[PDB]
Amino acid sequence: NEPVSCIRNGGICQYRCIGLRHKIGTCGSPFKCCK
Numbered sequence: 001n002e003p004v005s006c007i008r009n010g011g012i013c014q015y016r017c018i019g020l021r022h023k024i025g026t027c028g029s030p031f032k033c034c035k
Contacts, residue, residue: 006033 006025008025013027014034021034 009033013035 006027007008009024011027011033012035013025013031014021015031017023017032017034023032023034025033027033
């Protein structure tokens with residue numbers, strides 16, 4: 001993928017995210033992109 005996973009943006013990944021955290025995409029499958 002040219003755009004690479006959401007990690008390229010500099011955000012972090014986690015298995016699950018809570019409302020408090022915001023997700024703009026999915027870092028990976030076993031994790032999600034959240035900040």
